[PDB]
């Protein structure tokens, strides 16, 4: 059919794809620092992390007004991790493991919107 | 004239178009998170926009959003 939650699941597919490029550009920046100017590698990382956290804030806000609380539970723990980084503002091995999980989490949830949206459109 | 389900869809589409235009203007005209909201607001209210997107991937968002606010306003009237 046509519901407000069905449209919210459609905007996520276009927006979550942009969040994929951020975590992919992150592992590239960490790969360059592992091989080795150093200011440009970290200052750019500070500029890319802010939109990634703000865009996900809409994912927790769109589904809140869409009454789809079954999907919100799959995004609340992701937003809680952003509060730890925002509060406090070797490290290479720790941050590397803290970024590979982002690519897997932003991809497994990406397939949900590709299927949960179909579960409402064709189900008219 | 417009159901309450459409008014909730317009606001999130307005912000959704705005955040995409900011992401398009980031991979490369400033078009920050603030100027994109102003340009999209000036385009939805049929007013004269201050600036226009320079890149092709930014011009697509402008032309598509222009067709969106034209159909919605014409349907509301």
């Amino acid at each position: 059919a046509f519901t407000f939650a069905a449209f919210c699941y459609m905007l996520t597919l276009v927006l979550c794809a942009s969040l994929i490029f951020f975590v992919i550009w992150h592992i590239i920046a960490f790969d360059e620092l592992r091989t080795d100017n150093i200011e440009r590698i970290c200052c750019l990382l500070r500029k890319l992390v802010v939109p990634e956290y703000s865009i996900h804030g809409l994912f927790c806000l769109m589904f809140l007004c869409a009454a789809e609380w079954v999907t919100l539970g799959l995004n609340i723990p992701l937003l809680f991790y952003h509060l730890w980084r925002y509060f406090h503002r070797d490290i290479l091995n720790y941050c590397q493991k803290e970024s590979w999980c982002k690519l897997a989490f932003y991809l497994l949830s990406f397939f949900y919107y590709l299927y949960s949206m179909v579960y409402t459109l064709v189900s008219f | 004239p417009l159901a309450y389900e459409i008014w909730m869809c317009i606001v999130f589409a307005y912000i959704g178009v705005s955040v995409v235009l900011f992401l398009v203007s980031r991979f490369s005209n400033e078009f920050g998170i603030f100027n994109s909201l102003w340009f999209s607001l000036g385009a939805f209210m049929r007013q004269g926009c201050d600036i226009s997107p320079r890149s092709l991937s930014g011009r697509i968002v402008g032309g598509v959003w222009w067709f969106f606010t034209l159909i919605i306003i014409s349907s509301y009237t």
């Binding site: - | 398009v24 490369s28 890149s55 991937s57 598509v64």
Partner: peptide, 24 residues
Amino acid sequence: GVFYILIGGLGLAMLVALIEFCYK
């Protein structure tokens, strides 16, 4: 239909931005 057109335009713009970023 206009919402579908909006979503398709956003997706096409994202793809064109990806292409133009990978062009360099």
